[PDB]
Amino acid sequence: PRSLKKGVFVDDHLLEKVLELNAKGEKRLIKTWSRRSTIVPEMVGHTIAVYNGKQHVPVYITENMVGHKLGEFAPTRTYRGHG
Amino acid sequence: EQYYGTGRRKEAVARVFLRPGNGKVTVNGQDFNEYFQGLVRAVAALEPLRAVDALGHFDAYITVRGGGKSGQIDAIKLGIARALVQYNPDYRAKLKPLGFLTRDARVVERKKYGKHKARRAPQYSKR
Amino acid sequence: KLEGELRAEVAANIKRLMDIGCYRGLRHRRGLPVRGQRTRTNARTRKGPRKTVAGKKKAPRK
Amino acid sequence: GKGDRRTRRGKIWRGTYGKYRPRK
Amino acid sequence: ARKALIEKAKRTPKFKVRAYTRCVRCGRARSVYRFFGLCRICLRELAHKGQLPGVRKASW
Amino acid sequence: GNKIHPIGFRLGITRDWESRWYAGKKQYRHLLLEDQRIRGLLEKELYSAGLARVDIERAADNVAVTVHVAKPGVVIGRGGERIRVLREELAKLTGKNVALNVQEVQNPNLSAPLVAQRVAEQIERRFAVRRAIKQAVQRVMESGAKGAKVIVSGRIGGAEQARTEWAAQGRVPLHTLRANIDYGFALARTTYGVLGVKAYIFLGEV
Amino acid sequence: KIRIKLRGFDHKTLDASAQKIVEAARRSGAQVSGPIPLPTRVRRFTVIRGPFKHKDSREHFELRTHNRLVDIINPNRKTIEQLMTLDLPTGVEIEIKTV
RNA sequence: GCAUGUGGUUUAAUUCGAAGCAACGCGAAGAACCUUACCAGGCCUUGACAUGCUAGGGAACCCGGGUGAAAGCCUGGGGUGCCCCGCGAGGGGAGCCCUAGCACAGGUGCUGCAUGGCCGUCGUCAGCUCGUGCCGUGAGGUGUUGGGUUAAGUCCCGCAACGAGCGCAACCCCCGCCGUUAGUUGCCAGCGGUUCGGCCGGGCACUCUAACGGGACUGCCCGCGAAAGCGGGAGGAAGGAGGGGACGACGUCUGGUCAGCAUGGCCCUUACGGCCUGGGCGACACACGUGCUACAAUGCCCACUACAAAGCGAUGCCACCCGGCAACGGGGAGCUAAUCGCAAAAAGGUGGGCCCAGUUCGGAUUGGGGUCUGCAACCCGACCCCAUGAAGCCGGAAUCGCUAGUAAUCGCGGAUCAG
Numbered sequence A: 001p002r003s004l005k006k007g008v009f010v011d012d013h014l015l016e017k018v019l020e021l022n023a024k025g026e027k028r029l030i031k032t033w034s035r036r037s038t039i040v041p042e043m044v045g046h047t048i049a050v051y052n053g054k055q056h057v058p059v060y061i062t063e064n065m066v067g068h069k070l071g072e073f074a075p076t077r078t079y080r081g082h083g
Numbered sequence B: 001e002q003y004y005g006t007g008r009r010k011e012a013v014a015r016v017f018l019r020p021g022n023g024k025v026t027v028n029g030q031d032f033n034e035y036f037q038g039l040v041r042a043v044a045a046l047e048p049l050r051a052v053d054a055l056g057h058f059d060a061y062i063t064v065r066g067g068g069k070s071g072q073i074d075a076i077k078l079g080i081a082r083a084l085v086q087y088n089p090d091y092r093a094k095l096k097p098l099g100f101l102t103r104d105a106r107v108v109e110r111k112k113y114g115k116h117k118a119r120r121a122p123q124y125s126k127r
Numbered sequence C: 001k002l003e004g005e006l007r008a009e010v011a012a013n014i015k016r017l018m019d020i021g022c023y024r025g026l027r028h029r030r031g032l033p034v035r036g037q038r039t040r041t042n043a044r045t046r047k048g049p050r051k052t053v054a055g056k057k058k059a060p061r062k
Numbered sequence D: 001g002k003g004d005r006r007t008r009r010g011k012i013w014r015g016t017y018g019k020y021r022p023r024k
Numbered sequence E: 001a002r003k004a005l006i007e008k009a010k011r012t013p014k015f016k017v018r019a020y021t022r023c024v025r026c027g028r029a030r031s032v033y034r035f036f037g038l039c040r041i042c043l044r045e046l047a048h049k050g051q052l053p054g055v056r057k058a059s060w
Numbered sequence F: 001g002n003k004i005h006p007i008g009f010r011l012g013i014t015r016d017w018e019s020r021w022y023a024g025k026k027q028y029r030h031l032l033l034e035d036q037r038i039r040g041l042l043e044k045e046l047y048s049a050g051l052a053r054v055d056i057e058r059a060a061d062n063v064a065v066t067v068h069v070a071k072p073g074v075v076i077g078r079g080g081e082r083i084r085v086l087r088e089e090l091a092k093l094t095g096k097n098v099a100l101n102v103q104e105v106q107n108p109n110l111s112a113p114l115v116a117q118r119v120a121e122q123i124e125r126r127f128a129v130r131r132a133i134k135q136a137v138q139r140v141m142e143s144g145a146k147g148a149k150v151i152v153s154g155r156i157g158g159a160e161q162a163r164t165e166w167a168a169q170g171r172v173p174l175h176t177l178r179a180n181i182d183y184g185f186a187l188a189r190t191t192y193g194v195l196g197v198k199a200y201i202f203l204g205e206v
Numbered sequence G: 001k002i003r004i005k006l007r008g009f010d011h012k013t014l015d016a017s018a019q020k021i022v023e024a025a026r027r028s029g030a031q032v033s034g035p036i037p038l039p040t041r042v043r044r045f046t047v048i049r050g051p052f053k054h055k056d057s058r059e060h061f062e063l064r065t066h067n068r069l070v071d072i073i074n075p076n077r078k079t080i081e082q083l084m085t086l087d088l089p090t091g092v093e094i095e096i097k098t099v
Numbered sequence H: 001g002c003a004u005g006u007g008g009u010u011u012a013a014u015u016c017g018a019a020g021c022a023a024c025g026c027g028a029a030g031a032a033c034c035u036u037a038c039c040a041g042g043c044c045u046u047g048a049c050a051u052g053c054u055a056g057g058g059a060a061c062c063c064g065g066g067u068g069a070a071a072g073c074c075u076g077g078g079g080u081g082c083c084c085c086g087c088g089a090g091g092g093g094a095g096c097c098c099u100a101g102c103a104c105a106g107g108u109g110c111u112g113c114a115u116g117g118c119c120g121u122c123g124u125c126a127g128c129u130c131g132u133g134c135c136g137u138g139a140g141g142u143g144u145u146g147g148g149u150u151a152a153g154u155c156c157c158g159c160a161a162c163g164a165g166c167g168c169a170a171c172c173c174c175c176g177c178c179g180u181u182a183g184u185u186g187c188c189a190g191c192g193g194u195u196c197g198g199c200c201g202g203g204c205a206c207u208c209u210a211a212c213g214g215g216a217c218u219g220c221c222c223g224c225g226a227a228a229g230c231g232g233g234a235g236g237a238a239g240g241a242g243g244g245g246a247c248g249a250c251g252u253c254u255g256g257u258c259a260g261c262a263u264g265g266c267c268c269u270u271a272c273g274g275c276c277u278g279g280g281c282g283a284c285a286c287a288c289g290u291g292c293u294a295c296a297a298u299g300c301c302c303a304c305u306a307c308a309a310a311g312c313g314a315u316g317c318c319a320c321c322c323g324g325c326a327a328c329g330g331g332g333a334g335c336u337a338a339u340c341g342c343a344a345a346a347a348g349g350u351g352g353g354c355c356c357a358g359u360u361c362g363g364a365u366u367g368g369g370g371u372c373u374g375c376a377a378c379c380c381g382a383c384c385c386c387a388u389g390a391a392g393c394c395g396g397a398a399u400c401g402c403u404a405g406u407a408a409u410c411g412c413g414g415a416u417c418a419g
């Protein structure tokens, strides 16, 4: 995991959009590309559409899904089975 | 007073110093038998003496560096024989029969490319 | 925390992950590797024994 | 036991040091 | 060795870590030797020409 | 996938390097590329003068570029002007004190790189390829040489079928190490495509 | 008092140059520890021969930086005034440290 | 069982080539972004790069805001240099910049069956040929064949042949013995001083380091043979090519590669060019190839104790102290290095444990907690510690390697490289 000295990593510009959405009490959909961002408890209850290489898919953020990074909730490849 | 002989064997170099007396032998600041603690081969190193009958009539101050201990053994073993002749040029006659003056030319073979090992070719298996 | 009381926590830990709907979740669900291994070969301890299927005729003719 | 990362052999082969094969 | 990527190669990039070497000659990305800034093709070629100084052919 | 570059084989035994200097790991990378930028330019700018070798000796902030050329006047220039222009443009691209001297390849018939070239030109100028070769090899042996060999390969003539022509006289002992053997290679660039000329010249047993 | 290291690629020129320095220090009034052959640091390179595939053929090149030490104890002035007048091989680097 | 490559299938994309030996740990000696050629999305259009040209606006250049995932898009200020004419206002000009338009650049788009170069290959196999003479109407033969010998078209005898060229051999490198020159950062034999470390004096003997040399020729003896040469012995460190390297003949494969580079021809030019962010190359009902680790007692674990070589490193290797189970972190000496370091060599040796068990064998898989690199470890890094402790009890039909310091076995280094 990420070293504990440097805290966690979220892209400033996603963290940006939420603080404005919090410090105004608004719950409007967000889209981003930075899968790579951790999930601070500040994001909780929001909805973030994240890129999976093709589209943005909504990801409602509940409590228990905080330690993780956003990408874990939009798989990148499509699988059915073999026929 | 001393008699020297320089024995090498396969990346090992032995420095043999002979001085008559009891029979005791030092390698690298330890007793011969403590240095080669549990090595069977070790005894062979003192075959050059035994085959001229001068074991006991000498001591040895020896040093080795390089190789594994066995390599050091056949190097000492050379070095002693090399030394028995600077002392007594007539000893050659006794040693050359079993060829104790012969530097073992044998040595580790260059790893060659496209092999795994110099010879050990990679496996061809199936079709 | 020991015995079956520990089996509890590990079990309900994976359970969490599936219920979350995260990647490691799906991998657990579908019985695939989880820490990121290859699957085009090996990956056997996760999928148990080998369910051989049909296949084709390569490369020239037969 | 070269695959066993809890032996001297284990760390010897992985080229690492740990509890089970420390430096000095 | 598409032209742009030889130039991009030189562009000091947004992060220290997109630093990558190509061959000062062909521009080849892949088998590039630090020490010469040449690939293992170019190395071979210039070595035979005699234009890499003190670079002999080995043999032991 | 056959024969070894006759030079790199003999290199250090019967044949010398075209760059002679020392450099530690730190500096080498760039003094190399600096040489290659020099040899890049002088090669373009002097094809007219028929140039065999570009020697690059080096000190510290010093470069002794010896240029080996058939027609040494063409390099010099009328008045002495052309050489000054080079030396400045050199010391521009180098940013060091370039010391460019000129050396008269007294006999282009025993310079493989030149024999090579002369043929390639001939091939470009649309000359008969077979004759072109026998007649080149000819000229080489006529001038002392102990052996010689020229290989043109590619779309010979117009030719849909790319083949290979070659010819030799005397001994050209590519296996014999002590054999001084000059090699040179020329590339002919043509409306129908590109062909390569190798020329080997056996010069003397050492 | 004056210690000269000699590092170059070609060992003929390297060795030659060092003779031109063992004698320079003689004809000027001093004794000398001879040209000592320090070990030589080889840099090997192992390129695949062909351009594409065919990994099972390589070619081995090396880069041999040769090292000679030379010491001039009892260093006079008629010594130094015969050293900054030499320089005769090109591919040899000199470094002088009065230690 | 796992690591990699591949077939297939799947996919928005799983970039592309390699395809019997001679494709499959192969191009890749380093795919998280980059690489990167594929896919999705947002962007630029004389373009990220070359040399220019016509017309206008500008010194070049420097810093800040807006929007944005970034790219890009819009916008604010600072700045007036140089060359010529002039007293000056100022006109002209070089360079660089922007806008419009034109030559054009760019293309890892196609064709390796249009090519160069380089390589794989039969094959380090002993062959492939030419001048003259000779045989034959001629294609062609002779020589090169035959008998002996050889690793060898290597030599001997023979012969219508006598030679020669490319090949074999030799000249080059490493290893094995000795010499001369050389004494530091290496070395310690007798000696002086010792904090017991070659540490200090001192010395180069020895080891070594590394530059030049000597040495081996079937030379000697016996036996066989017209000869070449073969068997055996002596002296010798080495004996009949002493061991290993580099070195690939005329040609074959329409072999490989337009994706290293180069290049003919065909194709695209606000798109097949270029920038970016994200995804992919890592997908998984399956199949093969190459390998790692094992299935254990000639073993496993823990402790103590020995003996290497080759490399690498002053943007780095990091000794020693400290915290920490540890990865590692903080402090910090030496070293541009025969000095300082990486560095513990592991098998081995001595002691003790386990006692035939899916085990103190095996270490997959997963849960949890950390470390480091990196803008960033979800897809997809390695490492540490706790817990989990799968298959596997020596492998069917088939099949591979190796003839001596070889195989088997055990560790060590390096290239690429932030990792």
Ligand SMILES: NC(=O)OC[C@@H](O)C[C@H](NC(=O)[C@H]1NCCC[C@@H]1O)C(=O)N[C@@H](Cc1cnc(N)[nH]1)C(=O)N[C@H](C(=O)O)[C@H](O)c1cnc(Cl)[nH]1
Binding pocket: B127, C060, C061, C062, H020
């Ligand atoms: N390189 C090379 O020579 O081959 C070597 C080996 O791989 C053979 C290969 N063998 C196998 O698969 C077998 N091995 C085990 C797996 C399965 C199978 O049982 C193969 O494919 N054989 C048949 C198959 C077949 C049956 N029917 C069609 N149409 N094909 C074939 O294709 N023959 C060709 C022909 O009939 O012409 C071929 O071109 C050939 C020409 N001369 C010979 Cl001899 N062979």
Ligand SMILES: [Mg+2]
Binding pocket: A012, A013
């Ligand atoms: Mg922002």
Ligand SMILES: [Mg+2]
Binding pocket: B108
């Ligand atoms: Mg070995």
Ligand SMILES: [Mg+2]
Binding pocket: B108, B109, B110
């Ligand atoms: Mg060796």
Ligand SMILES: [Mg+2]
Binding pocket: B122, G055
């Ligand atoms: Mg291989």
Ligand SMILES: [Mg+2]
Binding pocket: none
């Ligand atoms: Mg191995």
Ligand SMILES: [Mg+2]
Binding pocket: D001, D004
């Ligand atoms: Mg175990």
Ligand SMILES: [Mg+2]
Binding pocket: E001, E002, E003
């Ligand atoms: Mg191109």
Ligand SMILES: [Mg+2]
Binding pocket: E017, E018, E019, E020
């Ligand atoms: Mg990189």
Ligand SMILES: [Mg+2]
Binding pocket: F002
């Ligand atoms: Mg050929």
Ligand SMILES: [Mg+2]
Binding pocket: F153, F164
């Ligand atoms: Mg060709």
Ligand SMILES: [Mg+2]
Binding pocket: G057
């Ligand atoms: Mg080969």
Ligand SMILES: [Mg+2]
Binding pocket: none
């Ligand atoms: Mg593929």
Ligand SMILES: [Mg+2]
Binding pocket: none
């Ligand atoms: Mg292609």
Ligand SMILES: [Mg+2]
Binding pocket: H030
């Ligand atoms: Mg890799």
Ligand SMILES: [Mg+2]
Binding pocket: none
């Ligand atoms: Mg990518």
